[PDB]
Amino acid sequence: CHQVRGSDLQVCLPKGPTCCSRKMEEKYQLTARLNMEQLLQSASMELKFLIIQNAAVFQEAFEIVVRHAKNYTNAMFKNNYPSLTPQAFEFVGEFFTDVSLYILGSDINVDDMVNELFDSLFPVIYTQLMNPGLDINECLRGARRDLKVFGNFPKLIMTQVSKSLQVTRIFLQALNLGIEVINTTDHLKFSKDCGRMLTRMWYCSYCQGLMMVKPCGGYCNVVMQGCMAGVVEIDKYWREYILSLEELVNGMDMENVLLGLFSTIHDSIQYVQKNAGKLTTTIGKLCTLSSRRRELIQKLKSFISFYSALPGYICSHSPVAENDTLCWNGQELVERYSQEPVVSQIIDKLKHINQLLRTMS
């Protein structure tokens, strides 16, 4: 043994003498772990950055659309229903606040936003528009629904906005989930047998005192196919996630729906006032964007074989003798080579988001 870069070892199969002890064997084991990790990192980096890019852009683009709709809706109220301000400035803000929250994954029930909106809207219509001239607020909030003053305008808005806010939410959910599974890949822990085999493949030749010999490609594939056995099962679910995503995008907006809200609300106010006469009395008694989507799907399809091409990536981006001549077989230099929990969580997450994508478009 010159420079290197009995027997009681536990990894390197000792044909006879050996250059390395049990302690240098443990060194070689940890550097195999570090090496596999770096390689997995490099495999997943470009795809990870792609989805990180678009998740950040699309989130702001959608946030811009909500802010613009809020101000337009606020301005339309200020201009057409000044008697309803400043109260309108408050329930419009309440609604679009929940819009963004619902878009970004918060537990928000759409039927509320609409119902809270109309529950807040009706008392100020009654007091300021229908019968001009504080303790009686809660009665009017209850009579709004008990007397169905807006007809089916709330249901109409409910379906108008729930369909458009659901697709936008799920699109952001799927982008962030892809980041989360791909980022999990470079942290995948493998079996101890795989680690011992990786050590034999990459480093045990130095223990026999060889300097330039590389492992056989065939030996690398048998080793890698054995290491990535659970990982390759993820391929079919990843391909369905890509295709389901491509389905959603080809089917697509939220701007028109949210911009159109004031028009629908205004007609709902007109409906109510068509009944002010009798309604007062009873209440008296009672009381390039699309271009970005395309380019993302284009780049995303180029990575559709990520999990199936992964073992080949590790073998090709490490020194191997793909020729299978004068190569290291794990225990001797040969002339020609002859012969889950975390994974299941990735599966489950891909299954869940793939249902959500399917049943949308």
Ligand SMILES: *[C@@H]1O[C@H](CO)[C@@H](O)[C@H](O)[C@H]1NC(C)=O
């Ligand atoms: C548009 O709406 C958003 C809502 O948060 C607000 O921050 C922004 O200042 C508005 N722009 C105006 C009022 O010019």
Ligand SMILES: *[C@@H]1O[C@H](CO)[C@@H](O)[C@H](O)[C@H]1NC(C)=O
């Ligand atoms: C990636 O995974 C690591 C470890 O699991 C975690 O610390 C990090 O926050 C994750 N990053 C993203 C963007 O998911």
